[PDB]
Amino acid sequence: GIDPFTESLKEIETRPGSIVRGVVVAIDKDVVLVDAGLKSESAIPAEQFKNAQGELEIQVGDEVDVALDAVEDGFGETLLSREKAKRHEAWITLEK
Numbered sequence: 001g002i003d004p005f006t007e008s009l010k011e012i013e014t015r016p017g018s019i020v021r022g023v024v025v026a027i028d029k030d031v032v033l034v035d036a037g038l039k040s041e042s043a044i045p046a047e048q049f050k051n052a053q054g055e056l057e058i059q060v061g062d063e064v065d066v067a068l069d070a071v072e073d074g075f076g077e078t079l080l081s082r083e084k085a086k087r088h089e090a091w092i093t094l095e096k
Contacts, residue, residue, distance in 0.1 A: 020068040024049075027060045036066040 022036035032049050033041040049064060050056040058064050078084075 018068045018070070020066055021063070022066045023063045024058055024060050027056075032056075032058070032064075034064055034066050036068065042066050 020036040022034045022042065024032060025035045025041055026033035028046070030046065032044050032046045034044055036042050044066060046056050049058045
């Protein structure tokens with residue numbers, strides 16, 4: 001039963017675009033590691049975090065935003081196709 005100034009701004013200026021908010025979990029010598037809420041630290045080049053001047057504005061622990069990418073893991077399985085096996089110009093029909 002108390003909240004004099006414990007309220008956040010109920011307004012948004014940014015827009016959606018497959019972006020996730022994470023935090024720098026590690027700062028490599030050339031690249032940077034950020035945690036966007038996953039087990040595998042999202043690999044991101046410091047060149048993207050830094051500025052045009054060429055100086056990393058962020059640091060280890062500093063909250064940074066990462067662009068949510070869309071990629072899956074396809075082990076890859078065999079599939080019966082025409083391109084798979086080689087065969088001279090020919091086809092097959094059914095209901096003969």
